[PDB]
Design a binder for this molecule. Sequence first.
Ligand SMILES: *[C@H](C)[C@H]1/C(=C/c2[nH]c(/C=C3N=C(/C=C4\NC(=O)C(CC)=C4C)C(C)=C/3CCC(=O)O)c(CCC(=O)O)c2C)NC(=O)[C@@H]1C
Ligand SMILES: *[C@H](C)[C@H]1/C(=C/c2[nH]c(/C=C3N=C(/C=C4\NC(=O)C(CC)=C4C)C(C)=C\3CCC(=O)O)c(CCC(=O)O)c2C)NC(=O)[C@@H]1C
Ligand SMILES: *[C@H](C)[C@H]1/C(=C/c2[nH]c(/C=C3N=C(/C=C4\NC(=O)C(CC)=C4C)C(C)=C\3CCC(=O)O)c(CCC(=O)O)c2C)NC(=O)[C@@H]1C
Ligand SMILES: CCC1=C(C)/C(=C/C2=NC(=C\c3[nH]c(/C=C4\NC(=O)[C@H](C)[C@H]4CC)c(C)c3CCC(=O)O)/C(CCC(=O)O)=C2C)NC1=O
Ligand SMILES: CCC1=C(C)/C(=C/C2=NC(=C\c3[nH]c(/C=C4\NC(=O)[C@H](C)[C@H]4CC)c(C)c3CCC(=O)O)/C(CCC(=O)O)=C2C)NC1=O
Ligand SMILES: CCC1=C(C)/C(=C/C2=NC(=C\c3[nH]c(/C=C4\NC(=O)[C@H](C)[C@H]4CC)c(C)c3CCC(=O)O)/C(CCC(=O)O)=C2C)NC1=O
Ligand SMILES: CCC1=C(C)/C(=C/C2=NC(=C\c3[nH]c(/C=C4\NC(=O)[C@H](C)[C@H]4CC)c(C)c3CCC(=O)O)/C(CCC(=O)O)=C2C)NC1=O
Lengths: 51, 48, 161, 161, 36, 160, 160, 162, 172, 172
Amino acid sequence: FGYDTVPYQRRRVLPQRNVGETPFNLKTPRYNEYHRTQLGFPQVIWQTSVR
Amino acid sequence: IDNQIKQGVNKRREQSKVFKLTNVTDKVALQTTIGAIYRQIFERDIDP
Amino acid sequence: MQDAITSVINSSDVQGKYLDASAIQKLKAYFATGELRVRAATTISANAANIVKEAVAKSLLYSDITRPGGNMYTTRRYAACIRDLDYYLRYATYAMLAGDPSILDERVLNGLKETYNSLGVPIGATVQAIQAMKEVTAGLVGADAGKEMGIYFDYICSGLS
Amino acid sequence: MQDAITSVINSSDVQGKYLDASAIQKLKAYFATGELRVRAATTISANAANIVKEAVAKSLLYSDITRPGGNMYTTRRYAACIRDLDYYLRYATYAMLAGDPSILDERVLNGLKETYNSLGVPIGATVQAIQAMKEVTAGLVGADAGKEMGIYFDYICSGLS
Amino acid sequence: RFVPQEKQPKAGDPANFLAMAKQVSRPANTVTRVAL
Amino acid sequence: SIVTKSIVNADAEARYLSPGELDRIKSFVTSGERRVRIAETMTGARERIIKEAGNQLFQKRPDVVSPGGNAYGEEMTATCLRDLDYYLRLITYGIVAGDVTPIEEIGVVGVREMYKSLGTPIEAVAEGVRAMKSVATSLLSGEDAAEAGAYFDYLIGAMS
Amino acid sequence: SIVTKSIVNADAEARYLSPGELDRIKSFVTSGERRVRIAETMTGARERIIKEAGNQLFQKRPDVVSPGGNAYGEEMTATCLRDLDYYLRLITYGIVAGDVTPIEEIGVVGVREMYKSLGTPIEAVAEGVRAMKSVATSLLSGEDAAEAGAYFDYLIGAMS
Amino acid sequence: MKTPLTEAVSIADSQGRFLSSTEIQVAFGRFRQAKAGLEAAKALTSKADSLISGAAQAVYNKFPYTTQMQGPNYAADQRGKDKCARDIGYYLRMVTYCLIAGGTGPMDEYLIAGIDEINRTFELSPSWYIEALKYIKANHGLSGDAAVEANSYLDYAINALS
Amino acid sequence: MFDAFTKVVSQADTRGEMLSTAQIDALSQMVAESNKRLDSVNRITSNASTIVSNAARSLFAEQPQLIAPGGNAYTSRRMAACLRDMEIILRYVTYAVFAGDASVLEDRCLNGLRETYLALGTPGSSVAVGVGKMKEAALAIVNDPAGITPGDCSALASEIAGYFDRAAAAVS
Amino acid sequence: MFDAFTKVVSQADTRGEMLSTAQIDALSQMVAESNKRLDSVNRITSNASTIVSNAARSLFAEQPQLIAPGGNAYTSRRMAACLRDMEIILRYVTYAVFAGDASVLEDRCLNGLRETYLALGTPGSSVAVGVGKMKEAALAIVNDPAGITPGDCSALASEIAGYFDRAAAAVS
Ligand SMILES: *[C@H](C)[C@H]1/C(=C/c2[nH]c(/C=C3N=C(/C=C4\NC(=O)C(CC)=C4C)C(C)=C/3CCC(=O)O)c(CCC(=O)O)c2C)NC(=O)[C@@H]1C
Ligand SMILES: *[C@H](C)[C@H]1/C(=C/c2[nH]c(/C=C3N=C(/C=C4\NC(=O)C(CC)=C4C)C(C)=C\3CCC(=O)O)c(CCC(=O)O)c2C)NC(=O)[C@@H]1C
Ligand SMILES: *[C@H](C)[C@H]1/C(=C/c2[nH]c(/C=C3N=C(/C=C4\NC(=O)C(CC)=C4C)C(C)=C\3CCC(=O)O)c(CCC(=O)O)c2C)NC(=O)[C@@H]1C
Ligand SMILES: CCC1=C(C)/C(=C/C2=NC(=C\c3[nH]c(/C=C4\NC(=O)[C@H](C)[C@H]4CC)c(C)c3CCC(=O)O)/C(CCC(=O)O)=C2C)NC1=O
Ligand SMILES: CCC1=C(C)/C(=C/C2=NC(=C\c3[nH]c(/C=C4\NC(=O)[C@H](C)[C@H]4CC)c(C)c3CCC(=O)O)/C(CCC(=O)O)=C2C)NC1=O
Ligand SMILES: CCC1=C(C)/C(=C/C2=NC(=C\c3[nH]c(/C=C4\NC(=O)[C@H](C)[C@H]4CC)c(C)c3CCC(=O)O)/C(CCC(=O)O)=C2C)NC1=O
Ligand SMILES: CCC1=C(C)/C(=C/C2=NC(=C\c3[nH]c(/C=C4\NC(=O)[C@H](C)[C@H]4CC)c(C)c3CCC(=O)O)/C(CCC(=O)O)=C2C)NC1=O
């Protein structure tokens, strides 16, 4: 990159393939499962019904 | 089937197991004998 | 008490002949599908208090039969009916791993019609609970085993009705 | 009852820390010599009716007791002095295959010392009969499996002393 | 016909029916230390 | 009733009723006009215990009516009131029988299988009878609620 | 061990080890290295397999985290980490033994009176185990999801 | 989460050193702040519901068009008023959270970081929230140094808005 | 990263022969309707901010748990990231219907974003329903001929609904 | 990365309501004892190099296999890395007892370093025993009086021993 070039994902796609490697922003999101469990997020859809 | 299961020893006299109590310091072998006492004296389960 | 190994090996015994090629295709049918049965056997025992729970919620509960006057009002016997509905659940698995309804004749349907009319329990309400239990099982274990486990469920509904 | 697999399970479990590299090594201490120990058992299972007569032939076939006027002279109690040799053999090969003296504490030696007084039976002859059984059980099992069985018979006669 | 209807387990009176606080928990607990 | 416990206690001896057991009916029947003059107000005041039973349970056990609990929302606060309405009757049914044995054969003896299966906690229904105990003792006189309060307390010890 | 109850099932019939049983005790030893590495993964990842799975319990049963509950607060769901770790411990002991007798010696038969004295419904705990089974098999391979989960289904049936 | 102890640990960690007397000066200062700030947060917790309704009424008073014109962004219908006063209570709750935390971190992480694009996408004027925060900072009724730093947090929210 | 034409070229090269005639008539009809494809694409593109705001508007009316505190889209920063995720999905849908191939939509979003939403704790169901509602509103906005000559958008409603359903199913 | 105050703020925001009064009295007592907490911290911090040198020496007197050739801490470079690992653990303990929360100690060390010591071949047992001995010496250095006014040092012994046991158990 030298001093004057913005970094980019080097050689993601091979010239004969319509599908390359996963973009790094999708491969490595802001946090993993470990920090997700600490935040106590509420998954599993919703609570449910009374019957 | 009339010659199979219908011979005269109704085949559960010699394929039903018995329960001994040789293992009084074993604990899980004790628990399936105590249920076998409950399921032969009262011969239902005594749970309800 | 018999088994699809044994009931084709004893019926060939009592005819005096040996392992016929028509008799050899029933054992290898049982040896092909036996891996499907043993993984289906563990999943019933892991859910055995929950197949009986969803059966009574879909067929039995919140009705006239648990209302005083019905037979289920005594909690002596609502303890006993979950015990009774457990009996058809475990013996269906014993009919499943044997591949044979012969245990159900000798250990479930020995005198079952007389003892239900001696107490006056409803026949079809129990048969409605077997029809509850056959669809709860086929969802929890997969339809390839529920289409075989339900055959011995219809063997119970034939003898009960 | 405590298997040597379950004992090294138990020694981490009374501490409650998990199975370490030392604690998995005890299983690899069992599994590396596991193959000969299983193959030792099929030799002692087929020969147990055969090997029980040479133990008394080396020790107590003609002696001062087995004549008229001593113990092991009824043919009823001569059955007992063969069946106890069958009892000591069948429980040592359990204790061989598990690798413990604890099954020997629970089953064969839970009250065996006290009962031999009031029956009026010679103990010390039965000490020599197991000690004669070592050299006939090591001739057929090989030299390598003959020494690991020797500490399990020695727990019996030290326990019978 | 169709048998009609009447009563049992009518219930239907909320009475107090206390409203829910609707709380939730962090699960960042001291697994190592609970009590003596 | 108090006779029926002594009847099977007589036949287990297979002898006649001993007079240690006869006078316990003589204390019962002459107080039988007293005992029917206790529980009929609890049949009379019917709702007043019951509406003061749920609200006195929910402040001592509020996790039951939360989401995730068995009793939740509407139609599952009323059947928990109606399963509580069942166990109000058997306190009166034990009083006019003079013994706790008709409470058993219709209402106690199979609780630990049906409440295991339904998921309702047996401790939580035990505190509801402990919640309805205080409002029933206030409606009776103090020497009359002292015997009827133990009739609650057996079901407390049977549930717990 | 798979030895020691094949001992017990051969002891009650008063018989030696059958050669049909002797292959089963032979094939366990040659596959003993295959189960100790999948028990290493539960030894290594024991902290992750309880922490998110505990939130799967409270997502599906939020009655426990409600106030007035059995396991309420930062110190009492701490005790659920101080209790469910033993069940994650013992499944590893069920794997390396080959069968369910380390489960059967420690944590099965007294739990009806354990959790009654604790006051916790067992099926609330058991649905935490069945949700833990769904997240344990996320770590296992497609082959080892059955056999390591085969010792799970004994524990789910023991609670229920 | 810009709170003083957190940022002191971040300074000492990025420098790669242990804690010095600087962080302890930060600490005796933070305890001095919290010694009044916690009671002021409790007082705001007490007066919160009337402050929310007064801010909503002042916002309807200064901008009367929002009550009149049909539009899902405007609070003409009732659901607009429920959601509206809900975000009034959101702003007040973030003010109390920053009063407890001792820094602008909670409002910066819960409110500020996306508020511009949200008001851009939803056609919400931020001046409505500026009017509401001005009414809150006029009517909170505190006194002294707690009142000055409460006004500091509210003015910070105002400057972050516009 | 493929066109329609590059897709036919790659298939003809994997066959190893020249392009057959029927594929060329298909591509001629594609070149005749490619502008037709385009008209929907431009009227889809011009209303994009209204589409994503109405989609989030109906979604957060529908599932108020996301707006509720502790919800996944509750925080202002997270809610802005939510609208950003939706706008990105709509943009790559417009790219795929520009190039006439779903391979751009696959390449740019699909293979990673399912695992991203699992790892983030993002509920895939709500964003799946949001992409479905956004696609329904997008076809509803495209199909109305206001100041446009009379034509046929049949097959292109087919293609656009295909792209939106592929996005919603790859999200899950 | 959480304080005590930010922990109460995050819990109150997940509840969605204001902070209750009893939490505010708890935080007032925390603000009264927070200086308490941290004089304790300062006398822990001033003796840190003595703590890690006494810990390592005690440890290498105890397990001479690490000093023995072929041992994990045998090489001079590896031994310097060993002392660096110990000093890092002590520093993050001091950070966690500064902020009054274990979340900083979790965030900075715990989740990765167990896998790091597995992958490196580092015995987790020795460093666990070393962190335990270092924590015992740290409380022993903190608890003694030498020209300081009497105070309720106790509980904070509770908290510091909690942090050290959390570190030693996360190491394993
Ligand atoms: C329950 C689904 C229905 C019902 C039942 C009710 N059942 C009672 C039950 C009895 N059930 C049995 C059945 C078996 N015993 C066995 O060993 C086996 C095979 C393994 C079976 C199928 C028996 C023997 C009894 C009565 C003996 C006893 O009292 O223990 C009763 C109990 C009789 C009583 O007077 O208490 C009641 C109501 N009623 C319903 O509502 C359901 C249709
Ligand atoms: C609203 C529809 C749903 C929702 C959205 C949501 N997404 C995030 C965070 C991320 N989303 C992505 C997704 C992509 N990044 C890409 O580069 C591409 C393709 C070009 C996609 C599809 C990523 C990588 C993240 C994490 C990093 C980031 O800044 O955004 C959030 C926020 C989570 C957070 O903690 O910040 C939200 C809220 N979530 C919902 O609740 C709806 C179901
Ligand atoms: C689709 C949902 C509706 C529809 C569209 C439609 N369009 C055409 C033809 C043309 N559309 C354009 C548009 C543009 N050309 C440009 O250069 C630009 C600027 C980027 C625009 C907006 C043009 C120019 C053509 C063809 C050439 C011309 O019009 O001069 C048709 C028929 C012709 C064709 O297939 O291209 C149709 C049907 N018609 C409907 O009924 C739909 C609801
Ligand atoms: C599985 C563990 C186990 C053992 C071994 C066992 C032995 C046992 N030995 C018995 C008798 C006996 N045991 C012996 C023993 C011996 N003969 C000798 O001379 C020697 C001293 C010794 C060498 C074997 C004799 C002679 C009798 C018969 C004594 C009698 O009945 O009077 C009896 C009472 C009668 C009987 O059932 O045979 C038991 C129960 N019981 C057990 O539970
Ligand atoms: C006289 C003897 C007798 C007993 C003991 C009895 C119990 C009983 N309780 C029931 C239901 C119920 N019972 C409750 C009760 C409770 N839920 C809670 O969380 C509380 C702990 C608790 C009471 C305060 C609930 C919620 C149901 C409905 C079960 C469901 O909807 O899943 C039902 C099924 C429906 C019905 O017929 O009412 C029975 C049969 N019935 C009887 O005839
Ligand atoms: C915790 C920090 C926080 C803030 C500040 C917040 C604001 C916020 N306000 C919103 C909408 C809104 N905001 C307003 C507010 C107003 N409109 C008016 O006319 C009044 C002047 C003013 C009343 C205060 C209204 C009426 C809506 C609903 C309009 C909509 O559909 O988008 C939305 C979109 C969600 C939705 O559509 O329901 C957000 C994210 N959310 C947050 O999580
Ligand atoms: C960063 C530079 C710095 C330091 C070092 C510092 C320490 C410090 N410790 C204090 C108090 C104190 N410090 C202690 C500490 C203890 N007492 C015991 O008996 C225990 C063994 C021990 C804790 C383990 C106690 C008990 C007090 C009483 C006053 C208070 O609660 O702050 C105070 C209160 C104000 C004062 O003393 O003038 C100061 C200044 N302040 C600073 O600005």
